[PDB]
Amino acid sequence: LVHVASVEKGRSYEDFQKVYNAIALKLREDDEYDNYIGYGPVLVRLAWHTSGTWDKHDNTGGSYGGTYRFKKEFNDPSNAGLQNGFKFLEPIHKEFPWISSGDLFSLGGVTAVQEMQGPKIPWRCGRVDTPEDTTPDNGRLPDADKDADYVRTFFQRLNMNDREVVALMGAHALGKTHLKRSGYEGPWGAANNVFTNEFYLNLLNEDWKLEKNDANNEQWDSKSGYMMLPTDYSLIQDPKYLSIVKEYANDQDKFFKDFSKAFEKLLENGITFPKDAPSPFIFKTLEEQGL
Ligand code: HEM
């Protein structure tokens, strides 16, 4: 199936900047969530999980149809906790009922990255809601207890190469694992609602110990109180991933640029943009607008 982007009728960059801004203002206001981490990280994860069901082989899943709104997908065990991001976005959608669900979930992620002082992420509109029966089955999102070979093979289905995978994984600077959600517990670093390359620095520089958490799962833990999932740790066990980790640990701008590309790509898999579609939008942050 071909999913052609269709601009919400009559809308242009200013309409979407208003949606951006409403997301960004609520991110600022609703600051208590998750022990004052705020909603930035879970919105980034919502954008990723709503996009990461894509299968390049048959164009099933992906961000286009906004299918997370249907119970099979919002109740995917892999999506446990993302209901908080959805609930956050509900008043946004009520204010701007014209935006499609896929456009709102993906825009939430862009807005979160940028408001957390991350790179600009160009964003294109035009996702169109598709019906309940287009919701992908559970099981397309990745397991965390696996090795580098798993990770590499997993991401081939999303058409991501080694550099794109290592870049995307840098989002694990953000937020934390929650035991009751994923069976893993702890943050990956100190700056977990500011977008930086800390994930790579911690992988290389902390003294990690392989421990069992209280759900009986193995994770890597440091004396600073940080953790890495087995799939995170695989990025320094595999020599190809390791090189790239070192690159991003040593060049913040490079990480920003590569993350931006990979994240836009993730959010756009599966969508065909007509030749005469608008160019991608680059939203101004609240700070840049003086808001
Ligand atoms: C091999 C791939 C990946 C695996 C196995 C994985 C696994 C996990 C797990 C287990 C959690 C913790 C969920 C919880 O307990 O709340 C998590 C959190 C998160 N992941 Fe991933 N992840 C992967 C890739 C990504 C990518 C590609 C991104 C986005 C670019 C991403 C962004 C996030 C964010 C932002 C959080 C924190 C959520 C929060 O604090 O609520 N992850 N991930």
CA-to-CA distance for 291 and 49, rounded, in angstroms?
30
Token pair 């200013």 in the structure block, residue = 14
Task: Kindly report the number of other CB atoms within 10 A of residue 197's CB atom.
Answer: 23
By residue count, the chain amounts to: 291
Rounded alpha-carbon distances, angstroms, from residue 101 to 13, 270, 282: 17, 16, 20
CA-to-CA distance for 136 and 210, rounded, in angstroms?
34
Task: Kindly report the number of other CB atoms within 10 A of residue 266's CB atom.
Answer: 23
Strand partners, 278: none
| CA 142–ligand 1 middle distance (angstroms) | 9
Question: Residue 103 in contact with residue 8, Cβ under 8 Å?
Answer: yes
Q: Amino acid identity of 184? A: Y
Catalytic one of 48, 54, 123, 188: 188
The structure tokens listed for 218 are 């193995």
The fold of 1-141+263-291 is Peroxidase; domain 1 (1.10.520)
The structure tokens listed for 192 are 């977990």
| CA 37–ligand 1 middle distance (angstroms) | 15
User: Which atom in ligand 1 lies closest to the alpha carbon of residue 37?
Assistant: 40
CA-to-CA distance for 111 and 210, rounded, in angstroms?
35
Write down the experimental method used for this entry: X-ray
Task: Give the H/E segment covering residue 271.
Answer: strand 271-272
Q: Is 3 annotated in the active site?
A: no
Let me know if domain 142-262 sits in CATH 1.10.420.10. yes
- The closest residue, in CA terms, to atom 18 on ligand 1 is 177
Nearest alpha carbon to residue 165 among 258, 46, 268, 78: 258
Question: Residue 33 in contact with residue 188, Cβ under 8 Å?
Answer: no
- The closest residue, in CA terms, to atom 12 on ligand 1 is 177
Ligand 1 neighbours, Cβ below 6 Å, are 41-42, 44-45, 48, 81, 142, 144, 151, 168-169, 171-172, 174-178, 181-182, 184, 229, 231, 263
- Which residues precede a break in the chain, with C-to-N distance above 2.5 Å? none
Question: Residue 199 in contact with residue 205, Cβ under 8 Å?
Answer: no
Rounded alpha-carbon distances, angstroms, from residue 14 to 202, 244, 281: 39, 37, 10
Say which DSSP state 207 is in. Answer: -
Q: Are strands 3-4 and 271-272 parallel, antiparallel or unpaired?
A: parallel
CA-to-CA distance for 258 and 242, rounded, in angstroms?
16
Question: Residue 68 in contact with residue 50, Cβ under 8 Å?
Answer: yes
The structure tokens listed for 222 are 């440091």
What are the structural domain ranges in the chain?
A: 1-141+263-291, 142-262
Question: Residue 172 in contact with residue 142, Cβ under 8 Å?
Answer: no
| CA 227–ligand 1 middle distance (angstroms) | 12
Rounded alpha-carbon distances, angstroms, from residue 120 to 116, 239, 242, 257: 11, 30, 26, 9
Q: Amino acid identity of 230? A: P
Question: Residue 157 in contact with residue 57, Cβ under 8 Å?
Answer: yes
Probe target for ligand 1 pocket from 37, 46, 48, with the most ligand atoms within 8 Å of CB: 48
Distance of CA 198 to the CA centre of its chain: 16
